[PDB]
Amino acid sequence: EPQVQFKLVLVGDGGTGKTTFVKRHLTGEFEKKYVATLGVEVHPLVFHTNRGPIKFNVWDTAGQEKFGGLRDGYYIQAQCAIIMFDVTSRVTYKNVPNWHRDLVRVCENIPIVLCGNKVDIKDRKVKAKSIVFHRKKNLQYYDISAKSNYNFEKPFLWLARKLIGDPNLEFVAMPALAPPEVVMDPALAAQYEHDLEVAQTT
Amino acid sequence: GTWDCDTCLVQNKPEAVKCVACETPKP
Numbered sequence: 713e714p715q716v717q718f719k720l721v722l723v724g725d726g727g728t729g730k731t732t733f734v735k736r737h738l739t740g741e742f743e744k745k746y747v748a749t750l751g752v753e754v755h756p757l758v759f760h761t762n763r764g765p766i767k768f769n770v771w772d773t774a775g776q777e778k779f780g781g782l783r784d785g786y787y788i789q790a791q792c793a794i795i796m797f798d799v800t801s802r803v804t805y806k807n808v809p810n811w812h813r814d815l816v817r818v819c820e821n822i823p824i825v826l827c828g829n830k831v832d833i834k835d836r837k838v839k840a841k842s843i844v845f846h847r848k849k850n851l852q853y854y855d856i857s858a859k860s861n862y863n864f865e866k867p868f869l870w871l872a873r874k875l876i877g878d879p880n881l882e883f884v885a886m887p888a889l890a891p892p893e894v895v896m897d898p899a900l901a902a903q904y905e906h907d908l909e910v911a912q913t914t
Numbered sequence: 915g916t917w918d919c920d921t922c923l924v925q926n927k928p929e930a931v932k933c934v935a936c937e938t939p940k941p
């Protein structure tokens with residue numbers, strides 16, 4: 713059996729929670745591969761779908777994004793991407809278009825999910841109404857909270873459906889994730905999800 | 915045919931003698 717796997721690049725401003733996010737997947741963390749030349753840790757994240765396992769090889773930087781764009785080698789052969797920002801830091805949202813631009817320059821029209829991280833933090837700065845870059849670009853958006861595992865599987869499920877070309881692909885079980893370090897208030901999640909729905913009707 | 919880089923997991927062209935992404939030589 714030929715294994716189904718995709719290079720996923722995980723980009724966004726430093727401090728947005730990319731590493732925290734990718735690390736939730738325990739096996740992906742244990743089996744991560746260090747790429748010395750590029751200063752990348754590739755986390756092989758397997759998800760079990762109704763059509764068998766799929767593996768996202770997630771490329772997590774070693775913080776270099778704080779000092780400039782990433783090198784071509786980081787992006788090359790990427791098959792999908794997550795662009796992350798921090799909903800408590802508007803500037804990270806403002807930089808989202810730049811990340812998308814750098815990404816598409818090397819990778820063209822690969823499937824990309826936009827993720828607004830740290831929604832567990834009560835004082836949210838970038839709210840649903842303001843989040844529109846994905847609309848302008850054919851991208852899917854999700855709120856996430858890396859620290860609580862909130863919506864962890866969402867970006868990967870959406871990407872898997874796009875990559876495999878199966879709108880009915882499902883994850884049959886969640887991968888083993890690091891136990892939440894903060895609680896994501898369910899009422900707050902419900903509100904945020906509602907706010908996003910409302911926003912999509914504008 | 916194509917080969918997978920053992921360092922970074924990128925799939926490379928049959929004619930590549932080193933990984934297009936991370937430069938690791940093909941084993």
Ligand SMILES: Nc1nc2c(ncn2[C@@H]2O[C@H](COP(=O)(O)OP(=O)(O)O)[C@@H](O)[C@H]2O)c(=O)[nH]1
Nearest residue numbers: 725726727728729730731732733830857858859
């Ligand atoms: N409250 C909260 N903090 C987070 C979350 N994700 C990351 N952080 C914090 O944000 C800071 C930067 O996270 P990091 O994963 O290193 O971001 P990166 O530079 O994009 O890889 C760290 O202090 C994390 O603990 C989250 O979902 N919720």
Ligand SMILES: [Mg+2]
Nearest residue numbers: 730731773775
């Ligand atoms: Mg990081």
Ligand SMILES: [Zn+2]
Nearest residue numbers: 919922933936
């Ligand atoms: Zn390589």
